[PDB]
Amino acid sequence: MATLLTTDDLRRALVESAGETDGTDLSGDFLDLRFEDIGYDSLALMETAARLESRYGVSIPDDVAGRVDTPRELLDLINGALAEAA
Ligand SMILES: *[PH](O)(O)OCC(C)(C)[C@H](O)C(=O)NCCC(=O)NCCSCCC(=O)CCCC(C)=O
């Protein structure tokens, strides 16, 4: 019932927020990899965040989206706010 955002969910959703950036690798452990390695833009991540905010019912300050380095931190932001909604 509580749709805790997993690595597999993120692997989908992250791609769902990238349009022209198709063809990266998000399958060979991207969780500790950096957004620069996975070819993610700055705006793309704001967008990724907003996507997740609106779907899961959370919120993340847009600057904090640019403060993350690795996807696990972004993921932490989501599930963190999600766990506050409980
Ligand atoms: P990232 O690490 O490249 O950082 C991006 C950003 C926007 C957080 C940062 O503040 C920045 O790029 N600052 C430079 C000054 C500036 O005004 N940048 C704008 C760049 S993109 C879009 C700006 C905007 O006002 C509206 C965009 C609306 C859309 C894309 O729909």
Pocket test for ligand 1, best of 21, 43, 45 (most atoms within 8 A of CB): 43
Q: How far, in Å, is the centroid of ligand 1 from the Cα of 3?
A: 31
Protein residues whose CB sits closer than 6 Å to any atom of ligand 1: 42-43, 66
For 5-34, b/e burial (b = at least 16 CB within 10 A) is beeebbeebbeebbeeeeeeebeeebeebe
Question: In sequence order, which residues have a C-beta less than 8 Å from that of residue 86 and are 6 or more positions away?
Answer: none
Q: For domain 1-86, give its CATH number from 3.40.50.620, 1.10.150.130, 1.10.1200.10, 1.10.3720.10.
A: 1.10.1200.10
Burial of residue 60 (number of CB atoms within 10 Å: 0-12, 13-18, 19+): buried
* Ligand 1 nearest atom to the CA of residue 62, by list position: 8
Nearest alpha carbon, ligand 1 atom 20: 43
Where along the chain do its domains lie? 1-86
Distances (CA, A) of 39 to 34, 75, 82, 83: 9, 17, 27, 29
How was this structure obtained?
NMR
The number of beta carbons lying within 10 Å of the beta carbon of residue 80 is 12
Q: How far apart are CA 78 and CA 81, in angstroms?
A: 5
| DSSP-derived secondary structure for 13-57 | HTGGG-SS--S---SS--TTS-TTTTT--HHHHHHHHHHHHHHHT
